[PDB]
Design a binder for this molecule. Structure first.
Ligand code: SF4
Lengths: 760, 358
């Protein structure tokens, strides 16, 4: 289907388009006209990805110069696969419509774990082990030695790409990760290096946030990215959490022990190699004194231990001669590690700013800021110059060096928290140091200041002003697209009163209440006896969920629920949770009622999507407020209050509502997809809490369903299920919620579409 | 043989029929039985619902049933191993069940890649640098029991691509053909207007004299006056009464005879038995018919031989039994009609077969 969007032709691969999709296209085009960052809110299951891809392809076809390359940022690998499939379908439609294969190149980027074919590395269960094995088999210095001696360790997968894979770029088209692996097997090449080589040529490149947001991994992609590149963020409502996790550092006593052991091993190796060849140390000193640009720029294959965290200004400055010597730097690292371990001896939690810790270290160990600034450079150079293969055992040393480099240069927005005792079990000796970053905008600041425009979309975007404050920027367009439905597919209800009229709440003071647990059990039993097989229940914490399950078993209410429908409970084990999900889906598709129990912060709420027959019922047991005992969260709240005038309670409410919407928003995949939404808490009735719900969900939240009872909720569920289970025809959607070729051309419909979106 | 004897005992009339057909050498047991010749799913409530029946007089009624034990074995293969390793030597069954009740075992209180591989859902798996036991046990054993029940219910890039296609495809923006119908349009619709009704001698009237008669009656009834005396007369009334009188032409026939007393109930029951036997024999005969394979010819010949033997050995004694009482009912006439119809059918088919060959 061909569409006219403000004078730009759009090749829609499907026969019909939602009016909200047309509004999204028009607003996205307007954002592209300003070449600036923009935030848009689109309901999930509306095919916004198809519209975005179509508009980007139209922009590239009309003017390749304006959008030199498309950057897509996602959350999980299956999201990348789905985006690749959708873009492949769109490209096939383009080729059929135009009659020729367009010179379009699409590529999906992932880790070496998803792009290695070497048989020895395949059984490895961990990416870091995979990376270490690959580097041991693909070290630059080892490559020449293998050329001089075949029996020496090597990886022909990279060698053939170096010999043959560089010359001829891949043909225009779209390749999946499995497709890339198959092509690499066909050519005997490694798809990882080939994909990185072809990034400069690919029109569209898709990968995850950490591949670009993390400064440690920023240069692995940004080196082949120009100023006019356009980035896309999808379902990035937790982007601040990702940035904080990337910029946060954790240190433990076992980490210190491993660091000491690896440092002693490194010193022994240095002495041994000096005995074998002292000239290596002199050559390293020559490299340091003459400039760091020679070693880093001439070896692009050594990107295993790249640390682009430091700004470009720090790169020019050289390491002081006090630590240029390898042995001097080893002693410096030993002193730093001993000082850190002694500082960890405190028996209580200590909260400190980076400048104070740096001043204390300078007073004690006579360590200035400038020598510590270039710690990462010396670390990387020393690791490279010693032909170290099994770098996995040396990971704690690299982590400590990166932490020291962060402290030496990054001060504002960071907090050092020392907790010698576990929050859960203070009796257990767990001395843990946390270098926590409270400024996520620093991770996204280079993205804003380097790329032409940034596009962020998500289904849970209730506040449109907190994100410009959280990300510390001013988006060009802040538009929310309301959802228009000819048939109601969502039935949000709030039940703050149980059968015994108990005030239903999930406050940790009331989370241990037996009455709340029993009312939850009764609600779940009635829902299982009434609602169809697909039932998912999101709790507030793992311990609370386990205690509630135990209480239900003791009461016996859980037994009746098992009698009605099969139950599956997730644990902290990944394999057990995977088996539980598989069994849940199999039971739901086999006609036997299956109930899943998870947490709002668990993996289920992160990257699991529910189809119409899976997302029949989603029940949130109270507003998921994060357990405040983590002083990192408290410190972040204090920093936000002191830097953005944001109340800590308001931020907690926003985060809890965001998690709840993420848990609920994944149950609808289209107009014909209808599901049930239950919120079992009286606190949801609060205007501040209720007003923090997505517009497409909050609008449909009828006030008649506000603070219902268990039986009232059951009756409303019965009514909604019977209403929506009746057969429906897509023709009814024509002109009301679905637009054909002729209906979109109506000027009245265009005015209606313009009225649909709202800019704030 | 024992199973066949028990089944025959379950149907004594058939057993009597089997005797009258085999002992009289009418049909062989092989030919007799030539034409003569439940699993329960696994429920998850078989544990919570099933309780040791604690009758008030200190009665521990286990109500041990085979299906319950089979469900336990299917859901818990370990219980089957325990049963096979203990009884009948190490311990008794009831003691094993009692131990199971007292043990903590009773009183306990991914093929798809995209949306199952939770370990592989993240591309950044770095190190850890960047009544809880009772609850965990309860959750683990509940999940194990659910998986066991699901498994007992039953008793590659292509798969990933198929799963992705199923997940992404939208029913709205696809195809809605649904035209699995065949239209029908007959040639001549006038067949039904005069259907199975045979051709009637629907004679047409004469020439314009028909119009003259129509005009005559039109004028005759155009000036009409109602009459009362002319409507009926006593003589006409007497004739109508006589026609409606008992024994009249309208009163066809009259009283009949009590057939029930004309035949003994034993003779009636034997007639029912013979009716059922001949009916089943002829049903098998017609099932063989039409003879489309050479094997059917021998089977129908055997059927006719069996019919002849049964007739001679039963109806002829039955005919004599009826004739000794000199019953006026021709009950045997119906059987003779059926037998002769079948015999003539077979003879005619044999004649057709001979004609086709020649
Ligand atoms: S070169 Fe490629 S195939 Fe070989 S170990 Fe490294 S990632 Fe794996």
């Amino acid at each position: 289907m061909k569409l006219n969007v403000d004078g730009l032709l759009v090749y829609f691969p499907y026969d019909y388009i939602y009016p909200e999709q047309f509004s999204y296209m028009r607003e996205l085009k307007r954002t592209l006209d300003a070449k600036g960052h923009g935030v848009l809110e689109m309901p999930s299951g509306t095919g916004k990805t198809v519209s975005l891809l179509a508009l980007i392809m139209a922009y590239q076809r009309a003017y390749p110069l304006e959008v030199t390359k498309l950057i897509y940022c996602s959350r999980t690998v299956p999201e990348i696969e789905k985006v690749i499939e959708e873009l492949r379908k769109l490209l096939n439609f383009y080729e059929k419509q135009e009659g020729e294969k367009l010179p379009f190149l699409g590529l999906a980027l992932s880790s070496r774990k998803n792009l290695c074919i070497h048989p020895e590395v395949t059984p490895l269960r961990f990416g870091k082990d995979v990376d270490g094995k690959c580097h041991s088999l693909t070290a630059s210095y080892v490559r020449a030695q293998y050329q001089h001696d075949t029996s020496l360790p090597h990886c022909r997968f990279y060698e053939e790409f170096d010999a043959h894979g560089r010359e001829v770029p891949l043909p225009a088209g779209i390749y999946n990760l499995d497709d890339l692996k198959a092509l690499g097997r066909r050519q005997g090449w490694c798809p990882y290096f080939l994909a990185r080589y072809s990034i400069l040529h690919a029109n569209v490149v898709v990968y995850s946030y950490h591949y670009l947001l993390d400064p440690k991994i920023a240069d692995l992609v940004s080196k082949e990215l120009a100023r006019k590149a356009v980035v896309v963020f999808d379902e990035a409502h937790n982007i601040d959490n990702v940035c904080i996790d990337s910029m946060s550092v954790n240190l433990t006593r076992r980490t210190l022990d491993r660091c000491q052991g690896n440092l002693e091993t490194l010193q022994k190796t240095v002495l041994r190699i000096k005995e074998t060849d002292e000239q290596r140390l002199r050559d390293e000193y020559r490299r340091l004194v003459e400039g760091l640009r020679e070693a880093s720029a001439a070896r692009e294959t050594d990107a295993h231990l790249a640390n682009p965290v430091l700004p470009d200004e720090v790169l020019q400055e050289a390491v002081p001669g006090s630590i240029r010597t390898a042995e001097h730097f080893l002693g410096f690292l030993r002193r730093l590690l001993e000082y850190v371990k002694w500082r960890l001896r405190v028996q209580h939690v200590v909260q400190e700013s980076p400048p104070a810790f740096l001043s204390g270290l300078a007073q004690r160990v006579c360590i200035q800021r400038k020598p510590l600034r270039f710690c990462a450079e010396r670390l990387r150079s020393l690791l490279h110059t010693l032909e170290i293969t099994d770098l996995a055992d040396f990971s704690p040393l690299t982590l400590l060096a990166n932490f020291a480099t962060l402290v030496s240069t990054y001060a504002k927005g960071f907090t050092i928290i020392i907790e010698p005792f576990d929050d859960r079990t203070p009796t257990i000796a767990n001395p843990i140091l946390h270098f926590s970053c409270m400024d996520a905008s620093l991770a996204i600041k280079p993205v804003f200041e380097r790329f032409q425009s940034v596009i962020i979309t998500s289904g849970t975007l209730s506040p449109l002003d907190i994100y410009p404050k959280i990300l510390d920027f001013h988006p060009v367009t802040m538009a929310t697209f309301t959802m228009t439905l000819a048939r109601v597919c969502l039935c949000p209800m709030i039940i703050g009163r149980g059968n015994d009229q108990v005030a239903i709440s999930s406050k940790f003071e009331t989370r241990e209440d037996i009455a709340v647990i029993r009312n939850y059990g009764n609600l779940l039993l009635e829902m299982s006896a009434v609602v169809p097989d697909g039932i998912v229940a999101f709790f507030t914490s793992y311990q609370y969920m386990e205690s509630t399950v135990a209480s239900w078993y003791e009461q016996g209410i859980l037994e009746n629920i098992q009698r009605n429908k099969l139950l599956f409970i997730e644990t902290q084990d990944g394999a057990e949770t995977s088996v539980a999900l598989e069994k849940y889906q199999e039971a739901c598709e086999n006609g036997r009622g299956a109930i899943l129990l998870s947490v709002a912060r668990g993996k289920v709420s992160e990257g699991i999507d529910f189809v119409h027959h899976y997302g029949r019922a989603v029940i949130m047991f109270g507003v998921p407020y994060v357990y405040t005992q983590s002083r990192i969260l408290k410190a972040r709240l204090e920093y936000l209050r002191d830097q953005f005038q944001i109340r800590e309670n308001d931020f907690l409410t926003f985060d809890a509502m965001r998690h709840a919407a993420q848990c609920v928003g994944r149950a609808i995949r289209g107009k014909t997809d209808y599901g049930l939404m239950v919120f079992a808490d009286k606190r949801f009735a609060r205007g501040d809490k209720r007003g923090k719900l997505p517009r497409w969900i909050q609008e449909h939240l009828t006030d008649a369903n506000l603070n219902l009872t268990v039986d009232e909720g059951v009756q409303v569920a019965k009514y909604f299920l019977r209403q929506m289970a009746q057969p429906f025809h897509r023709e009814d959607q024509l002109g009301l919620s679905l637009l054909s070729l002729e209906q979109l051309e109506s000027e009245e419909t265009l005015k209606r579409i313009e009225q649909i979106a709202q800019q704030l | 043989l024992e199973e066949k004897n028990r089944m025959l005992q379950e149907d004594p009339v058939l057993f009597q029929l089997y005797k009258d057909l085999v002992v009289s050498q009418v049909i062989s047991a092989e030919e007799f039985w030539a034409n003569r010749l439940q699993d329960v799913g696994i429920s998850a409530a078989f544990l919570a619902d099933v309780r040791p029946q604690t009758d008030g007089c200190n009665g521990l009624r286990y109500n041990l049933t085979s299906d319950i034990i089979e469900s336990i074995f299917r859901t818990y293969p370990a219980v089957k191993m325990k049963y096979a390793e203990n009884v009948p030597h190490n311990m008794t069954e009831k003691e094993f069940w009692t131990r199971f009740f007292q043990s903590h075992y009773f009183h306990r209180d991914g093929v798809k890649n995209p949306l199952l591989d939770l370990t592989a859902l993240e591309d950044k798996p770095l190190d850890e640098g960047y009544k809880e036991n009772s609850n965990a046990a309860i959750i683990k054993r509940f999940n194990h029991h659910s998986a066991m029940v699901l498994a007992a219910g039953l008793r590659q890039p292509a798969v990933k691509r198929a799963k992705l296609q199923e997940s992404i495809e939208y029913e709205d923006l696809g195809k809605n053909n649904s035209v699995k119908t065949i239209a029908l349009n007959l040639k001549k619709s006038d067949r039904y207007y005069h259907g199975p009704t045979p051709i009637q001698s629907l004679q047409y009237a004469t020439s314009q004299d028909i119009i003259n008669s129509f005009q005559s009656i039109r004028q005759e009834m155009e000036a009409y006056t109602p009459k009362l005396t002319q409507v009926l007369s006593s003589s006409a009334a007497s004739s109508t009464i006589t026609a409606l009188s008992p024994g009249g032409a309208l009163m066809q026939g009259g009283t009949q005879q009590a057939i029930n007393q004309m035949v003994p109930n034993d003779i009636q029951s034997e007639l029912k038995h013979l009716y059922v036997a001949v009916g089943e024999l002829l049903r098998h005969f017609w099932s063989c018919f039409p003879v489309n394979t050479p094997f059917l010819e021998e089977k129908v010949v055997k059927m006719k031989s069996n019919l002849e033997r049964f007739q001679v050995t039963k109806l002829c004694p039955f005919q004599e039994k009826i004739r000794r009482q000199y019953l006026s009912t021709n009950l045997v006439s119906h059987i003779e009609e059926m037998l002769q119809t079948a015999y003539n059918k077979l003879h005619t088919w044999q004649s057709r077969r001979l004609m086709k060959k020649t």
